[PDB]
Design a protein around this ligand. Structure first.
Ligand SMILES: [Mg+2]
Ligand SMILES: [Mg+2]
Ligand SMILES: [Mg+2]
Ligand SMILES: [Mg+2]
Ligand SMILES: [Mg+2]
Ligand SMILES: [Mg+2]
Ligand SMILES: [Mg+2]
Ligand SMILES: [Mg+2]
Ligand SMILES: [Mg+2]
Ligand SMILES: [Mg+2]
Ligand SMILES: [Mg+2]
Ligand SMILES: [Mg+2]
Ligand SMILES: [Mg+2]
Ligand SMILES: [Mg+2]
Ligand SMILES: [Mg+2]
Ligand SMILES: [Mg+2]
Ligand SMILES: [Mg+2]
Ligand SMILES: [Mg+2]
Ligand SMILES: [Mg+2]
Ligand SMILES: [Mg+2]
Ligand SMILES: [Mg+2]
Ligand SMILES: [Mg+2]
Ligand SMILES: [Mg+2]
Ligand SMILES: [Mg+2]
Ligand SMILES: [Mg+2]
Ligand SMILES: [Mg+2]
Ligand SMILES: [Mg+2]
Ligand SMILES: [Mg+2]
Ligand SMILES: [Mg+2]
Ligand SMILES: [Mg+2]
Ligand SMILES: [Mg+2]
Ligand SMILES: [Mg+2]
Ligand SMILES: [Mg+2]
Ligand SMILES: [Mg+2]
Ligand SMILES: [Mg+2]
Ligand SMILES: [Mg+2]
Ligand SMILES: [Mg+2]
Ligand SMILES: [Mg+2]
Ligand SMILES: [Mg+2]
Ligand SMILES: [Mg+2]
Lengths: 272, 92, 44
RNA sequence: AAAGACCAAGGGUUCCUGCGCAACGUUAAUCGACGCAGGGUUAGUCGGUUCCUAAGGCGAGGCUGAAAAGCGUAGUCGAUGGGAAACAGGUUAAUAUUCCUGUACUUCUGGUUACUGCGAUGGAGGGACGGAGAAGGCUAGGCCAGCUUGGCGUUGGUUGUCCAAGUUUAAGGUGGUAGGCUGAAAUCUUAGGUAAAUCCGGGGUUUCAAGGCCGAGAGCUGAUGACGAGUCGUCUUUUAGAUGACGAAGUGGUUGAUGCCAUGCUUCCAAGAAAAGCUUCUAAGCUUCAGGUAACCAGGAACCGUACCCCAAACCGACACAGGUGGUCGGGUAGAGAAUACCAAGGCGCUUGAGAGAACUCGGGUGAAGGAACUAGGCAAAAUGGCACCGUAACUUCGGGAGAAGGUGCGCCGGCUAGGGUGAAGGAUUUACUCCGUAAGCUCUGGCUGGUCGAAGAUACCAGGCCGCUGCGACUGUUUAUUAAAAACACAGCACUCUGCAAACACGAAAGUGGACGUAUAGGGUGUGACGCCUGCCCGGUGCCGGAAGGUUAAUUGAUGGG
């Protein structure tokens, strides 16, 4: 489902698109939609605070059910949809009581599949259960950190985590970052991989496609004047002239920035 | 209107050429009215006074003219005009 | 050639009118200053 | 395709009439957007207000902050969006979808009658929406013919296959069409819709398949009306302003929108407002009540704007300033066309003229012979230019290059000839806004030949110059508003690095907010800059990362000594 475009024009050369024909061709589920107005990555104060954000497409937010807390009641997937809010696909579960919900679609999940969450959920790659009921060695996604807070960890397209160890009240997961982390065994997770794993194979072909996604251009620091950037200045084209730093002076080649002593006990082994 | 307001609504007939032509041809009479006189208060006032039957009242506000003269820009008062149409027999 | 003044009475009111000035403390200071000088016009 | 007519913004009386000309008007002025005075703007349906919300604002308490305040919950505002309804004709010096005539529509209030479970701040539905493309169906508008009225042409001809003008008519009602969407009904039950639900959602049976929703437009009616050149009153009044009765024809064909069906359909990816009005369901309450429903009668629809200019002399530019100013309408012939030329409806000749016809300047026309010798440089100019057809190189990422290059034809009038569309007949479904089909007539596209005029037929306007080598940047894009458009910036792609979520990072004394209602295929920073082949050696310096045996080392503590 990776399609390379023919070079019928400049800007179409090097366009590689993910075209999923199994996605829903109609409208999303209206009761689960919600207004989502854009910021230009701008603050409470009206200040930017996050550069390169602006001018994408209008998007409805989809109310994705991250706390799959309808334990016991089975569901039918019955649809997989496109979500503009995330790189993963979403599936519209229809529960046995008729309630409809949106969840992150797992890898092999198609319309008509049966998903269930709870303690006694069968071990198949769409189901959700607390991490203590997940056998060691399973591949999981959408892992809670706080019981009841909802899925937080493995959520983007193709994301997954590996359950490597299980102590008393904690479970050790291997994140796709390579970090070994401790998670409460009471926290819920969904078995399997997240869908749309081929999303990384796509290539935008042109400057416009990045603008379609709401990303404004990045200007290099060496292209500026010294008043704007630490890398600015120089007659002719020059390098940074100093150890590379952010526009606010923080070194950006190495120079670890993690300063969270509160959560340090949850990190077994650290990788990024 | 349920008081002595009846006497403070109509300020007097309008004495234009358009007014007299309207009085003759149609049965409409142009009055000067208070600027806060509603169309219902004008109809009631012209019925209590003048002892006639009013068919329809239409009103318009008239901007006072400025006349920038003699050390400054003056201004005449804004005033309201009512076109009052009666039954054909009545002449007010 | 488009010039700097592009009149809009609604924008003029919302940026410089009496209620815009009375909404803040520095705006109330402008009205105090303009009353103390004796300006015939107070706001626009 | 405006230099015409409008809507908005902005302005504010500049609008019209009488009087007037000092100043204002780049001259004069009897004239005026100028002076004095008077007049002029009429709404249930237009636009506001009112209802509803977007971004955003303010924000009871609240949280935070030396103070001033900041942020924000409940709320409350905030259109550029959503939400009831009106058209034609007449009329003023100046208003008209507002006044008058005619015909409508919407929504409220009161009362009477008859029947009846009504009730939200809640549930559900609905409202309710993207880009592009297509092929239909209409309509406005255009043209032609017929008809009516008038004419018979200062000069050859013109009683005719002649000329001119007109040939109009809305909303609404009826109609449910082209066409679009969706299976419908009964019954039983139910982990859902924060509580309840008879509504919605889910589940199980039985029956029938045709029920429902939407929907341009046609026809009929509206309309015996209105309008209509003109005729007869002629008071007049010359310039023919008005003056009040009558008033002919008012029909077919074709073409046809960028308007409507259409918020439809197809397709794509970048995945496409909200809320209310509206329908429906119940909760608290209310139970002869109230309330609801339907019919009839009666009455109402308040307030504000409305003049006038609005590609402009009335707005933004100090000016009656060659600039700028959002949206709508936009006829004819030619034309692909909203280009262009000439015209229409309308509107103008741009507020100093009159001469003369020197140099020189500006903007053009033509030019002997030569043809880039000019010049820093072919700057400028000249040239090319349309359609159909033939033909077209290296190189290539296979798309291109390419309109490569280059060439042929082109007007007008006949002869023959091939097909679109529409279309009375007739036939069918002789069910009806039905289908098939149709002679003539209109209309569109061709083919083959012949003749003919001119120097010249893409005859005007309009309308690519082209080729070869090489540097730079891959490309479309962006930029020094006002001497720089580039090789600069961006860019897709690449890589390094940070970041485990109360993320890094950023703005904030803070609360909080962005990142993100995202979660390592993610987010930030840095550098490089499509693609192809690649990207070598150096860790001494500086930075960063990791380690911690040793040395040194802060506040602190205060042994000991000396007073
Ligand atoms: Mg980048
Ligand atoms: Mg850059
Ligand atoms: Mg620079
Ligand atoms: Mg610096
Ligand atoms: Mg250098
Ligand atoms: Mg009236
Ligand atoms: Mg009014
Ligand atoms: Mg104009
Ligand atoms: Mg004046
Ligand atoms: Mg005038
Ligand atoms: Mg003068
Ligand atoms: Mg005047
Ligand atoms: Mg606030
Ligand atoms: Mg307070
Ligand atoms: Mg409001
Ligand atoms: Mg609006
Ligand atoms: Mg007018
Ligand atoms: Mg609701
Ligand atoms: Mg569209
Ligand atoms: Mg003759
Ligand atoms: Mg049909
Ligand atoms: Mg007007
Ligand atoms: Mg100027
Ligand atoms: Mg002038
Ligand atoms: Mg001008
Ligand atoms: Mg413009
Ligand atoms: Mg033109
Ligand atoms: Mg020559
Ligand atoms: Mg020659
Ligand atoms: Mg030559
Ligand atoms: Mg030379
Ligand atoms: Mg020379
Ligand atoms: Mg040149
Ligand atoms: Mg030229
Ligand atoms: Mg020449
Ligand atoms: Mg060179
Ligand atoms: Mg370039
Ligand atoms: Mg410049
Ligand atoms: Mg330039
Ligand atoms: Mg570079």
């Amino acid at each position: 489902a990776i399609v390379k475009c023919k070079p019928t024009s400049a800007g179409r050369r090097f366009v590689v698109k993910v075209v999923n024909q199994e996605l829903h061709k109609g409208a999303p589920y209206a009761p689960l939609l919600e207004k989502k107005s854009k910021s230009g990555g701008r603050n409470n104060n009206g200040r930017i605070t996050t550069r390169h954000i602006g001018g994408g497409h209008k998007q409805h937010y989809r109310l994705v059910d991250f706390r799959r807390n309808k334990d016991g009641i089975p569901a039918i997937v019955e649809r997989v949809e496109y979500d503009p809010n995330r790189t993963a696909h979403i599936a519209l579960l229809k529960y046995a009581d008729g309630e409809r919900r949106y969840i992150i679609a797992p890898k092999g999940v198609a319309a008509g599949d049966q998903l269930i969450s709870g303690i006694g959920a069968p071990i198949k790659a769409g189901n959700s259960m607390p991490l203590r009921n997940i056998p060691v060695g399973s591949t999981v996604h959408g892992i809670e950190l706080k019981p009841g807070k909802g899925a937080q960890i493995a959520r983007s397209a193709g994301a997954s985590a590996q359950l490597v160890a299980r102590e008393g009240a904690y479970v050790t997961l291997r994140l796709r970052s390579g970090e070994m982390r401790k998670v409460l065994a009471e926290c819920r997770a969904t078995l399997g991989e997240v869908s749309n794993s081929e999303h990384s194979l796509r290539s935008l072909g042109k400057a416009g496609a990045t603008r379609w996604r709401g990303v404004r251009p990045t200007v290099r620091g060496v292209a500026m004047n010294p008043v704007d950037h630490p890398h600015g200045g120089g007659e002719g084209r020059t390098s940074a002239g100093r150890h590379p730093v952010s526009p606010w002076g923080l070194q950006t080649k190495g120079k670890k920035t993690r300063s969270n002593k509160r959560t340090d006990n949850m990190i077994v082994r650290r990788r990024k | 209107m349920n008081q002595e307001r009846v006497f403070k609504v109509l300020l007097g007939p309008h004495i234009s050429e358009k007014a007299t032509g309207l009085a003759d041809g149609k049965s409409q009479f142009v009055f000067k009215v208070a600027t806060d006189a509603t169309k219902l208060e004008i109809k009631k006032a012209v019925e209590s006074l003048f002892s006639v039957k009013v068919q329809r009242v239409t009103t318009l506000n008239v901007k006072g003219k400025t006349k920038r003269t003699a050390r400054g820009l003056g201004k005449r008062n804004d005033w309201k005009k009512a076109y009052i149409a009666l039954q054909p027999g009545q002449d007010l | 050639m488009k010039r700097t003044f592009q009149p809009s009475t609604l924008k003029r009111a919302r940026v410089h009118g009496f209620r815009a000035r009375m909404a803040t403390k520095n705006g109330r200071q402008v009205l105090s200053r303009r009353r103390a000088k004796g300006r015939k016009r107070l706001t626009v």
